[PDB]
RNA sequence: AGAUUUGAGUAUCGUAAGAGGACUCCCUUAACUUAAGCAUAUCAAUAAGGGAAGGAAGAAAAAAUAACAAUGAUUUCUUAAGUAAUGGCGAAUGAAAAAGAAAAAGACCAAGUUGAUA
RNA sequence: UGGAAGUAUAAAUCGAAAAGGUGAUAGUAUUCAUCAAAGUCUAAAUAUUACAGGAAAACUGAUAGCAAAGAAGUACUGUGAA
RNA sequence: GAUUCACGCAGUGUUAACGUGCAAAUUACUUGUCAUAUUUGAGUAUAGGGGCGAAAGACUCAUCGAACUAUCUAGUAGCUGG
RNA sequence: UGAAACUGUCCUUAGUGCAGAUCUUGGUGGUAGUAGCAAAUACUAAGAAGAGGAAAAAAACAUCUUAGAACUGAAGAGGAGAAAGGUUCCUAAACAACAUUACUUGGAUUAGGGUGAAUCGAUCCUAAAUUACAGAUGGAAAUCCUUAAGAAA
RNA sequence: GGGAACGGGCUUGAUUGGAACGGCGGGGAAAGAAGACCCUGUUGAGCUUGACUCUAAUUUAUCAUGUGACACUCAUUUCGUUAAAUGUUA
RNA sequence: AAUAAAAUAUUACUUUGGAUAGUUUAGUUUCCUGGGCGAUGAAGAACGCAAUGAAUUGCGAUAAGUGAUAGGAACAAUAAAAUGUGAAUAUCCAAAAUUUGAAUGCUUGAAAGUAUACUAAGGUAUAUAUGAUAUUCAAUAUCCA
């Protein structure tokens, strides 16, 4: 909704921040196994349920 | 980081107060430089000034609380921050003097009939 | 078996009284000295329709016996009562329609 | 049941699996008690004596011809032996009024 | 119409986020949390929910103070 | 472990659904839900008589 | 007016709360199951619910056993013993003394007495 | 409760004492034996699959062993408990 | 709490379409109804031997002649399969 | 072929031998290049961009502009809000996957940008109703009471 | 034909060229579902009823000590108020 | 009668798939030592903090870390700056310790807020129950002028 509580909006912003991939420099670390973030979601694929 | 704790300890309270303002003001400028495409030298400097502020505040606070412990060392009512570190259970237990306290009748019995040292011949 | 409708009526969830637009509680005024041993006068200001009951209710206004102010009452209207009428409550009240007597 | 056998009386119809006690700590009770005995041997040194116990007869006619260690000497046995009952407990003698 | 059609009017939340446990388990009309048992002072735990006990209990979080007291 | 393989609320679906009568993992949303359950022959279920430490 | 009694507000110094509950002390009248049915019984101080604790807890110093050539607080182990007993005397349930060991330790209140009483 | 003409607890009524309780077949009588209830504390020997730190193993070896040998109670499902 | 048409809604018939569908109940035409015992949103109240029901054992989150979920529980099976 | 462990004999031990359990888990065939990609009237010409209309008509060609031809027909396939969603909004680069052909298009990929209130709302007031201290009740969990029970409000 | 009494397979015959496209609805006792009709379990559940055995609610009797010889109030019950002239004199 | 396109059969090579073999920073069980939380604000939850981070880890406005004590030359994916005038690293220590949560001035839905007192802001304190002491009271409740 347009109308929302202040703390609810900040939890919406955090979910936007966490919907990002692994940076390139992190993928070049030695002994690295983290290439894709599996905690990723999209608005039309999975509803975050909050 | 470059602030040299020995040099921090050489300043007075007023000098240590003004240094924090100078460090805080410098850190504010470097934060502006980071978002305006600053050089890597300026960004590396910004991490140094961040630790100097933490270092300066550590000496300010440690020197202040050491003076408060001396102030309340003999005081009857000591603030709960300066009391010795204990668990909640420890503050509830009886004092060792109170645990081994004995009645007047029992005190003299242990004085006139103590556990003797002996041995049996075989 | 199940619970009959007469049993479900005693819990009072959807069977509570629909008493939202009711005027109030219709009753005499609290008995005091001035009505045990004297008479008080009340003016019938208006006659209203109390929802959920078939009889009209009268808004009677007694002045006050002991303090300064008003005493707004709510009687069950007797047949023949009219607006602006003076009614009397007390032991020595006359035997007229609308008066409240022992 | 088939053929000749005894009538079986096994009380396993309850939950015995939570009533099972295993003795895997038996080899380490021996070490724990023996070590505590040795530290008991010091501290109270000498004479970690387990207190002198009386000679009493076992109860019932099934055992009454045998002697065994009782608990504590009676006041008359201490008086007969000329021992103060207050000092007796401090020199490793068990007392049982 | 009890299947696909009746799901069109589902736009009112029964539960929102809880302040104490952080789960979307705060019943709005009941005014209590179905997961942590909010305003009730004690945290809601049941012996038949053995998995729910190992999902949120001591040691499942940061242990900010107790990680120092025990090691001391 | 005494609870190894027995940590589900699984029940058999019964007949009439074209699948065997072994208990099935309840719920939905994962690959585990609707799979086999405690049975000795099933994957991730308890084995034949579990070896007791007594 | 003064001497008490009881009950309040405030200030000061403290105390309880919540987590955990494997082991510990309790409350509450489950059923599946077994009895080849089932209703007492069994499952069973069992599950779930509820309260309280500690590094251990509980218990502990005889209004106790016994009938002996007598023992002697409590706890725990061995044996007694699937025994005595209970039970649609069916299915089933079921101890304790004696005896052998680990460890051992006994102390106070009340009441009584002393009152230039403290 | 094994406790069987009542082993223990509780409730309703009743209710002691110039003491008395027990000796498990109810009753009364006389002996005998042994204790002396209706307040409190008490180390040690004992238990432990919480949790933490260690050591072992005729145990498993990636469909096995904990559900989890990787950001595992994670991804994902449900309004929610789960 | 008259008769009708329209916006809407329903579901009389075709026992039409579809029936591994647009759809775990929809589509088309025909038909009916289309404001006072009317329609509808949000808030709120009522909970499982319970609720709610102009009453069909109907509805209570695709679950109802007793919801869902977890524990007792690997319930028992003289019966079927290996 | 494979590159770091293994075998023979005697005893001991067992989570010890599979074709079946609508068995469990995983992988894979025939069906089969098959059924289908047929509601919502509809597209065409020139040009541009692009690797992407070629050619013995391979008869069909996504995006943008213009011209033609059309549909929803103002109780709309128009312009805005509440709930719900949560960045899907805007721009640029880029098209591996996704939208039952393809896509240079996109609600898709990557990176940035974007939400400005004394006057709009929330905040404030009360409605149906809801929940506290003390009190009443209960073995317990807890239940009741909402101004009545209170030196409270 | 016989066979578990209605064979694609077995026996004896009729007969046969390999790969298939479009249709079609005879057969595959075609697919979907551990028959829902019937019976058997010493298997259930909903509902009914002087089926057996119980139970909430209701009801009756006894016990639970207010005074004075029916009368009173003093516990107790149900109320009303801003606890706002109650009772006896004047 | 005839062809071997399809079909069938065996081997080699390749492919789809991930069995088998070798391996293990992970489990399971038994035992030993403790069993050391909280109004001095716990466990849990949320948010935030790295030069380039989304998760995870560590930490709390002094932020992937500060002081002190040990420790002695690294880190690295890339670039910086610092460094024997002391880099990493370790800790029962010191300082500091956001919003909540028993949550405790009042309110709390996803709520933004707000009162008083002490020391414009900032920081403290103010829930309920309860023990002791002090002080101010109330009730002719008992005496009592």
PDB file of C-alpha atoms (C1' of nucleotides) in Angstrom, chain J residues 4-6 26-28 122-124 133-134 151, chain L residues 16-18 21-23 112-113 128-129 137-138:
ATOM      1  C1'   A J   4      46.653 -45.371  -4.433  1.00  0.00           C
ATOM      2  C1'   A J   5      45.720 -48.407  -1.855  1.00  0.00           C
ATOM      3  C1'   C J   6      44.661 -53.870  -1.542  1.00  0.00           C
ATOM      4  C1'   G J  26      17.144 -40.849  -8.322  1.00  0.00           C
ATOM      5  C1'   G J  27      17.717 -41.325 -13.456  1.00  0.00           C
ATOM      6  C1'   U J  28      15.631 -42.882 -18.295  1.00  0.00           C
ATOM      7  C1'   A J 122      -2.028   9.032   9.963  1.00  0.00           C
ATOM      8  C1'   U J 123      -1.331  11.445  14.751  1.00  0.00           C
ATOM      9  C1'   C J 124      -6.570  13.590  17.734  1.00  0.00           C
ATOM     10  C1'   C J 133      -3.829  -2.182  38.736  1.00  0.00           C
ATOM     11  C1'   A J 134      -6.789  -3.468  43.043  1.00  0.00           C
ATOM     12  C1'   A J 151      -8.144   5.573  51.058  1.00  0.00           C
TER      13        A J 151
ATOM     14  C1'   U L  16      22.655 -38.798 -21.210  1.00  0.00           C
ATOM     15  C1'   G L  17      23.002 -40.315 -16.168  1.00  0.00           C
ATOM     16  C1'   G L  18      25.778 -40.501 -11.686  1.00  0.00           C
ATOM     17  C1'   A L  21      36.036 -47.724  -6.010  1.00  0.00           C
ATOM     18  C1'   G L  22      39.339 -44.518  -3.079  1.00  0.00           C
ATOM     19  C1'   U L  23      38.549 -40.372   0.618  1.00  0.00           C
ATOM     20  C1'   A L 112       4.064   7.720  14.207  1.00  0.00           C
ATOM     21  C1'   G L 113       4.110   9.278  19.926  1.00  0.00           C
ATOM     22  C1'   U L 128       3.067  -4.403  40.009  1.00  0.00           C
ATOM     23  C1'   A L 129       3.888  -7.038  44.384  1.00  0.00           C
ATOM     24  C1'   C L 137      -1.456  11.311  57.895  1.00  0.00           C
ATOM     25  C1'   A L 138      -6.671   8.644  58.627  1.00  0.00           C
TER      26        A L 138
END
